Design an enzyme around this catalytic site. Structure first.
Site, PDB file in Angstrom:
ATOM      1  N   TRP A 220       4.374   1.243   2.204  1.00  0.00           N
ATOM      2  CA  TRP A 220       3.524   0.812   2.627  1.00  0.00           C
ATOM      3  C   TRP A 220       2.235   1.122   2.003  1.00  0.00           C
ATOM      4  O   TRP A 220       1.933   2.152   1.619  1.00  0.00           O
ATOM      5  CB  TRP A 220       3.419   0.400   4.188  1.00  0.00           C
ATOM      6  CG  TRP A 220       3.240   1.906   4.923  1.00  0.00           C
ATOM      7  CD1 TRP A 220       1.951   2.722   5.087  1.00  0.00           C
ATOM      8  CD2 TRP A 220       4.285   2.671   5.596  1.00  0.00           C
ATOM      9  NE1 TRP A 220       2.541   3.907   5.801  1.00  0.00           N
ATOM     10  CE2 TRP A 220       3.532   3.743   6.123  1.00  0.00           C
ATOM     11  CE3 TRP A 220       5.657   2.447   5.790  1.00  0.00           C
ATOM     12  CZ2 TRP A 220       4.284   4.591   6.834  1.00  0.00           C
ATOM     13  CZ3 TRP A 220       6.312   3.416   6.476  1.00  0.00           C
ATOM     14  CH2 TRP A 220       5.545   4.374   7.185  1.00  0.00           C
TER      15      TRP A 220
ATOM     16  N   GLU B 132      -5.947   1.142  -1.802  1.00  0.00           N
ATOM     17  CA  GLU B 132      -5.384   0.809  -3.045  1.00  0.00           C
ATOM     18  C   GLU B 132      -5.614  -0.663  -3.303  1.00  0.00           C
ATOM     19  O   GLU B 132      -5.706  -1.129  -4.561  1.00  0.00           O
ATOM     20  CB  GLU B 132      -3.929   0.870  -2.845  1.00  0.00           C
ATOM     21  CG  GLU B 132      -3.544   2.314  -2.610  1.00  0.00           C
ATOM     22  CD  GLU B 132      -1.809   2.485  -2.440  1.00  0.00           C
ATOM     23  OE1 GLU B 132      -1.181   2.121  -3.386  1.00  0.00           O
ATOM     24  OE2 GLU B 132      -1.417   2.421  -1.160  1.00  0.00           O
TER      25      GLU B 132
ATOM     26  N   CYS C 203       1.105  11.842  -4.378  1.00  0.00           N
ATOM     27  CA  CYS C 203       1.311  10.954  -3.162  1.00  0.00           C
ATOM     28  C   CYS C 203       0.921  11.577  -1.890  1.00  0.00           C
ATOM     29  O   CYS C 203       0.938  12.587  -1.385  1.00  0.00           O
ATOM     30  CB  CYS C 203       2.841  10.672  -2.904  1.00  0.00           C
ATOM     31  SG  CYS C 203       3.284   9.586  -1.525  1.00  0.00           S
TER      32      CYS C 203
ATOM     33  N   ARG D 191       3.060  11.668   1.865  1.00  0.00           N
ATOM     34  CA  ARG D 191       4.281  12.592   1.951  1.00  0.00           C
ATOM     35  C   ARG D 191       4.570  12.954   3.299  1.00  0.00           C
ATOM     36  O   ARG D 191       5.496  13.634   3.632  1.00  0.00           O
ATOM     37  CB  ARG D 191       4.112  13.655   0.946  1.00  0.00           C
ATOM     38  CG  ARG D 191       4.545  13.113  -0.542  1.00  0.00           C
ATOM     39  CD  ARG D 191       4.331  14.380  -1.300  1.00  0.00           C
ATOM     40  NE  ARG D 191       2.794  14.686  -1.618  1.00  0.00           N
ATOM     41  CZ  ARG D 191       2.630  15.774  -2.529  1.00  0.00           C
ATOM     42  NH1 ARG D 191       3.535  16.920  -2.436  1.00  0.00           N
ATOM     43  NH2 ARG D 191       1.264  15.884  -2.751  1.00  0.00           N
TER      44      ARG D 191
HETATM   45  C1  HEM Z   1       5.227   5.521   3.009  1.00  0.00           C
HETATM   46  C2  HEM Z   1       3.776   5.203   2.404  1.00  0.00           C
HETATM   47  C3  HEM Z   1       3.359   5.495   1.146  1.00  0.00           C
HETATM   48  C4  HEM Z   1       2.138   5.493   1.114  1.00  0.00           C
HETATM   49  C5  HEM Z   1       1.022   5.220   1.799  1.00  0.00           C
HETATM   50  C6  HEM Z   1       1.894   6.072  -0.167  1.00  0.00           C
HETATM   51  C7  HEM Z   1       0.669   6.429  -0.906  1.00  0.00           C
HETATM   52  C8  HEM Z   1       0.498   6.774  -2.052  1.00  0.00           C
HETATM   53  C9  HEM Z   1      -0.834   6.441  -2.801  1.00  0.00           C
HETATM   54  C10 HEM Z   1      -2.071   5.918  -2.536  1.00  0.00           C
HETATM   55  C11 HEM Z   1      -0.381   7.041  -4.090  1.00  0.00           C
HETATM   56  C12 HEM Z   1      -1.694   6.862  -5.260  1.00  0.00           C
HETATM   57  C13 HEM Z   1      -1.381   5.413  -5.920  1.00  0.00           C
HETATM   58  C14 HEM Z   1      -2.104   4.991  -6.992  1.00  0.00           C
HETATM   59  O1  HEM Z   1      -3.583   5.455  -6.856  1.00  0.00           O
HETATM   60  O2  HEM Z   1      -1.707   4.217  -8.160  1.00  0.00           O
HETATM   61  C15 HEM Z   1       0.975   7.437  -4.341  1.00  0.00           C
HETATM   62  C16 HEM Z   1       1.553   7.810  -5.116  1.00  0.00           C
HETATM   63  C17 HEM Z   1       2.802   8.183  -5.406  1.00  0.00           C
HETATM   64  N1  HEM Z   1       3.817   8.061  -4.279  1.00  0.00           N
HETATM   65 FE1  HEM Z   1       3.269   7.388  -2.408  1.00  0.00          FE
HETATM   66  N2  HEM Z   1       3.219   6.350  -0.836  1.00  0.00           N
HETATM   67  C18 HEM Z   1       3.995   6.122   0.007  1.00  0.00           C
HETATM   68  C19 HEM Z   1       5.326   6.053  -0.112  1.00  0.00           C
HETATM   69  C20 HEM Z   1       6.174   6.472  -1.195  1.00  0.00           C
HETATM   70  C21 HEM Z   1       7.473   6.574  -1.342  1.00  0.00           C
HETATM   71  C22 HEM Z   1       8.282   6.061  -0.375  1.00  0.00           C
HETATM   72  C23 HEM Z   1       7.593   7.231  -2.500  1.00  0.00           C
HETATM   73  C24 HEM Z   1       9.206   7.455  -3.153  1.00  0.00           C
HETATM   74  C25 HEM Z   1      10.044   7.421  -2.394  1.00  0.00           C
HETATM   75  C26 HEM Z   1       6.433   7.676  -3.171  1.00  0.00           C
HETATM   76  C27 HEM Z   1       6.096   8.300  -4.519  1.00  0.00           C
HETATM   77  C28 HEM Z   1       4.829   8.331  -5.034  1.00  0.00           C
HETATM   78  C29 HEM Z   1       4.901   8.691  -6.247  1.00  0.00           C
HETATM   79  C30 HEM Z   1       5.881   9.368  -7.310  1.00  0.00           C
HETATM   80  C31 HEM Z   1       3.383   8.718  -6.524  1.00  0.00           C
HETATM   81  C32 HEM Z   1       2.823   9.145  -7.758  1.00  0.00           C
HETATM   82  C33 HEM Z   1       2.445   7.940  -8.839  1.00  0.00           C
HETATM   83  C34 HEM Z   1       2.157   8.635 -10.279  1.00  0.00           C
HETATM   84  O3  HEM Z   1       2.373  10.041 -10.764  1.00  0.00           O
HETATM   85  O4  HEM Z   1       1.433   7.884 -10.998  1.00  0.00           O
HETATM   86  N3  HEM Z   1       5.587   7.450  -2.102  1.00  0.00           N
HETATM   87  N4  HEM Z   1       1.296   7.275  -2.844  1.00  0.00           N
HETATM   88  C1  LIG Z   2       0.697   5.445 -15.986  1.00  0.00           C
HETATM   89  C2  LIG Z   2       1.825   5.021 -15.039  1.00  0.00           C
HETATM   90  C3  LIG Z   2       3.139   4.723 -15.427  1.00  0.00           C
HETATM   91  C4  LIG Z   2       4.040   4.307 -14.546  1.00  0.00           C
HETATM   92  N1  LIG Z   2       3.709   4.240 -13.197  1.00  0.00           N
HETATM   93  C5  LIG Z   2       2.360   4.759 -12.874  1.00  0.00           C
HETATM   94  C6  LIG Z   2       2.142   4.564 -11.243  1.00  0.00           C
HETATM   95  C7  LIG Z   2       3.392   4.506 -10.614  1.00  0.00           C
HETATM   96  C8  LIG Z   2       3.156   4.608  -8.925  1.00  0.00           C
HETATM   97  C9  LIG Z   2       3.710   5.310  -8.378  1.00  0.00           C
HETATM   98  C10 LIG Z   2       3.678   5.242  -6.874  1.00  0.00           C
HETATM   99  C11 LIG Z   2       2.698   4.713  -6.514  1.00  0.00           C
HETATM  100  C12 LIG Z   2       1.966   3.757  -7.009  1.00  0.00           C
HETATM  101  C13 LIG Z   2       0.890   2.918  -6.451  1.00  0.00           C
HETATM  102  N2  LIG Z   2       0.020   2.361  -7.314  1.00  0.00           N
HETATM  103  C14 LIG Z   2       1.556   1.861  -5.512  1.00  0.00           C
HETATM  104  C15 LIG Z   2       2.249   2.560  -4.239  1.00  0.00           C
HETATM  105  C16 LIG Z   2       3.545   2.526  -4.245  1.00  0.00           C
HETATM  106  C17 LIG Z   2       4.276   3.166  -3.063  1.00  0.00           C
HETATM  107  C18 LIG Z   2       5.692   3.309  -2.797  1.00  0.00           C
HETATM  108  C19 LIG Z   2       3.249   3.230  -2.003  1.00  0.00           C
HETATM  109  C20 LIG Z   2       1.957   2.938  -2.156  1.00  0.00           C
HETATM  110  N3  LIG Z   2       1.306   3.068  -0.902  1.00  0.00           N
HETATM  111  N4  LIG Z   2       1.483   2.543  -3.005  1.00  0.00           N
HETATM  112  C21 LIG Z   2       2.117   3.556  -8.456  1.00  0.00           C
HETATM  113  C22 LIG Z   2       1.453   5.056 -13.672  1.00  0.00           C
END
Ligand code: HEM
Ligand SMILES: Cc1ccnc(CCc2cccc([C@@H](N)Cc3cc(C)cc(N)n3)c2)c1
Ligand code: HEM
Ligand SMILES: Cc1ccnc(CCc2cccc([C@@H](N)Cc3cc(C)cc(N)n3)c2)c1
Ligand SMILES: C[C@H](O)[C@H](O)[C@H]1CNc2nc(N)[nH]c(=O)c2N1
Ligand SMILES: C[C@H](O)[C@H](O)[C@H]1CNc2nc(N)[nH]c(=O)c2N1
Ligand SMILES: [Zn+2]
Lengths: 405, 405
Positions: free
Chosen positions: B281, B286, B109, B112
């Site tokens: 957001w 993305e 993420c 953060r």
């Molecule tokens: C506040 C604005 C936020 C932005 C701009 C953001 C941005 C992102 C982006 C770009 C990714 C990569 C997504 C992708 O390529 O599919 C990501 C991953 C993630 N974010 Fe965020 N994030 C935000 C808020 C959050 C919040 C609120 C949470 C949880 C409370 C969160 C948890 C995660 C997690 C768990 C992943 C990893 C997903 C994975 O392992 O596949 N984020 N974030």
């Molecule tokens: C393989 C697989 C299985 C289950 N889930 C996933 C991805 C889950 C995911 C988690 C966080 C962000 C996004 C992002 N694709 C969407 C997203 C979410 C939030 C909270 C903010 C943001 N800017 N963009 C996707 C992958």
């Protein structure tokens, strides 16, 4: 266990079984992944002997004469030489095979589709820095070929226990000077500030331009390095212009045609070749994005953006992105017009996908470093972004070694 | 220097050592023989109690009362409860702390810097699918806040021995249908063909456009999932237009405002929250680069390039790069016009660099997955490209979990 390798664009799976033939440690352990590190984390006769045999076996299998009497006699000669002397020598055709394998095995190289087409110059009979220069001059002439660039490597004498190494001090055979100002800033290539200063201090008369070609600092064993200026007709260069933006030529920008890396160590069957410079041709984003746009290189993004009249006060105009694209376009156009070999990052990554497919059938895998393979602009627009990759160290190999000062 | 991973920034020359990786009590995918950091998928009472004690110790340090009498009493109450029932329950402030920590810990993420600002809605009293729907609708209204987006998570009841889980079947709360066509193409979002078909099997009457918002499939313990249509006034969408290319609005493209992930597991002190949807957001790449230009998603790059009149028959025109930039800009422009919160990849990455510095001082490291943090266009133009990163799993954590069907 055996890594599963998935392509996320296509849904297809392979298993890398060549990873098992790796005899090393990479930077990573159970609790943390250290793959993004640019440097891995730590820069007798039995040892040498097993690495020797393994390499002899790779050679004889490569020519389909494994188990032959030639194969068994070569194993005996290597054994007899290591037991008396603690070292051995490669035959020329083994050195050629070994250099090709080192390239094939380099996980950071996107150009590996070309790996079987490598001209190898044996320079192991070299005894002086003067002779190093004549071999380097002949390699540049061969590899340049008036712009029809050909891949090559020149191998100087191996490391030996009693003594200092043959080294080329410069990091590439062609580099631009970087002159530090009393006020911090740099004129030229900030990447070359230190080699520039070494060159002045061994007697070079410096220029004062942005694109001054460096001399070479060539060192034979346990002697101070000597300075050799390359004759300017040997160094082919390309002035950069843009195909539609007329003011781009006015920036006065240019780059050299020949990328020739001169500071890496070549390991083959346990022997180490501390000077073995190799050359190919550029991928445009090396010049266009990294050398000209990196903030710690020529850093020209802001100039180009102002010339294009873009809004620079705010990241959300995507000024950096529009400017980078035009600079990459100028490099491609300019090289094409000068008839000098270059490959764009789309055609290069497509060719690498085909390489992974050949290697899967040939060897059951291919070592590849995802962070270095995916280009530095437009990542996800190339097929390699969607391809899982496994990074591991096979031998023969190219490696980093310490700067000799 | 130190015994911990050395982490370098190659743009600035600066070095840190990560000491936080010590508290990873859980292994990742890599071993000494091979790097697997580009793999996308990463495959008892005394066991729960060690995790629970660990998490209670973290809570009490965070409020600076570690060793306190309150800390010792909580540790004992947790063992007493596990002892008699097999499980335990978190206090309201512990759940708040835990859910923020899980975001803070997420290595993929880039958002953060915002971790401390997360509204936690406690929905552990929920007993039916109808009620999950009300809580999700309230979450969407709160987070959307008419375009001024606010980060939020809603936590449904924890997994519980014997009894079935609460699960939202959809991967996000807002998603577009993908309808398989007779010829074999997809109309709508090809990522969503499986969920679309499951909605159809479970009684939804499907539309046939490219941007049809899906209904939610919501499952309460031990029941068939039930289908719920989101009122369309809850789902804020943004039509796309470009600031200077007037024809772009004519393509009829759009995206939703709220990115709200609903299929991950939230793990805290060994307790598992199988339904805990969270939203923030968008970063603009993305939508603009992955969702609209991936070949396996809406795949619109060629159609844009043709409207820009680019040479799409040769890679060396850079037609992909120039169209992707314009699509990204249209995204930013359109969200800005509509007053819906969005961040571009330059602002985002600069803020993540600030987050890394804050975490260096607070905790002695930050776990980060370089391949996911570096954006998918313009990589080396962002400061994160030049920054080494250490990847490891800390807990509390968000984790993947198998699809409920
Ligand atoms: C506040 C604005 C936020 C932005 C701009 C953001 C941005 C992102 C982006 C770009 C990714 C990569 C997504 C992708 O390529 O599919 C990501 C991953 C993630 N974010 Fe965020 N994030 C935000 C808020 C959050 C919040 C609120 C949470 C949880 C409370 C969160 C948890 C995660 C997690 C768990 C992943 C990893 C997903 C994975 O392992 O596949 N984020 N974030
Ligand atoms: C393989 C697989 C299985 C289950 N889930 C996933 C991805 C889950 C995911 C988690 C966080 C962000 C996004 C992002 N694709 C969407 C997203 C979410 C939030 C909270 C903010 C943001 N800017 N963009 C996707 C992958
Ligand atoms: C023929 C055209 C070639 C192309 C287009 C090419 C392309 C590249 C690219 C883009 C890189 C990334 C390096 C960087 O970003 O700094 C690279 C790395 C590398 N290439 Fe090539 N390559 C070519 C030929 C060669 C040859 C001839 C050799 C050796 C015989 C070679 C060995 C390597 C090695 C060892 C690296 C890794 C450097 C490191 O670990 O830091 N390649 N290649
Ligand atoms: C951190 C560090 C320490 C020591 N050496 C290095 C880089 C060594 C290097 C090797 C191969 C290619 C390149 C590229 N930078 C230059 C290059 C060379 C060739 C043969 C083709 C091409 N297209 N580009 C650089 C980095
Ligand atoms: C930290 C990161 O590993 C480092 O900046 C790498 C990233 N990827 C790279 N990729 C290539 N081809 N060349 C590079 O110099 C780098 N730099
Ligand atoms: C193979 C590779 O791991 C995969 O395609 C990753 C690369 N980086 C990514 N990074 C982000 N942020 N999101 C992604 O989906 C991916 N895909
Ligand atoms: Zn790793």
């Amino acid at each position: 266990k055996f890594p599963r390798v998935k392509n996320w664009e296509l849904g297809s799976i392979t298993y890398d079984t060549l990873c098992a033939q790796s005899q090393q440690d990479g930077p990573c352990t159970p609790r943390r992944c250290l793959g993004s590190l640019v440097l891995p984390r730590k820069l007798p006769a039995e040892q040498l002997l097993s690495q020797a045999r393994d390499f002899i076996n790779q050679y004889y299998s490569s020519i389909k004469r494994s188990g032959s009497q030639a194969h068994e006699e070569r194993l005996q000669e290597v054994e007899a030489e290591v037991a008396s002397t603690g070292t051995y020598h490669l035959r020329e055709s083994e050195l050629v095979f070994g250099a090709k394998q080192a390239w094939r095995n380099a996980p950071r190289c996107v150009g590996r589709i070309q790996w079987g087409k490598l001209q190898v110059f044996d320079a192991r009979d070299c005894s002086s820095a003067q002779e190093m220069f004549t071999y380097i001059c002949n390699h540049i002439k061969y590899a340049t070929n008036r712009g029809n660039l050909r891949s090559a490597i020149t191998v100087f004498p191996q490391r030996a226990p009693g003594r200092g190494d043959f080294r080329i001090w410069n990091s590439q055979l062609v580099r631009y000077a970087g002159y530090r100002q009393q006020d911090g800033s740099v004129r030229g290539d900030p990447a070359n500030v230190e080699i520039t200063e070494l060159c002045i201090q061994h007697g070079w008369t410096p220029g004062n331009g942005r694109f001054d070609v460096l001399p070479l600092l060539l060192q034979a064993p346990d002697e101070a390095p000597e300075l050799f200026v390359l004759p300017p007709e040997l160094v082919l260069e390309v002035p950069l212009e843009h195909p539609t933006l007329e003011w781009f030529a006015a920036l006065g920008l240019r780059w050299y045609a020949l990328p020739a890396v001169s500071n890496m160590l070549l390991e083959i069957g346990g022997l180490e070749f501390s000077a073995a410079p190799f050359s190919g041709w550029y991928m445009s984003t090396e010049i266009g994005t990294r050398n000209l746009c990196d903030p710690h290189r020529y850093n020209i993004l802001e100039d180009v953006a102002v010339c294009m009249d873009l809004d620079t006060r705010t990241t959300s105009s995507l000024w950096k992105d529009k400017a980078a694209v035009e600079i990459n376009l100028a490099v491609l156009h300019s090289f094409q017009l000068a008839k000098v070999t270059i490959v764009d990052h789309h055609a290069a990554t497509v060719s690498f996908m085909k390489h992974l497919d050949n290697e899967q059938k040939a060897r059951g895998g291919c070592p590849a470093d995802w962070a270095w393979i995916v280009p530095p602009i437009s990542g996800s627009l190339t097929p390699v972004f969607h391809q899982e990759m496994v990074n591991y160290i096979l031998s023969p190999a190219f490696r980093y070694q310490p700067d000799p000062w």
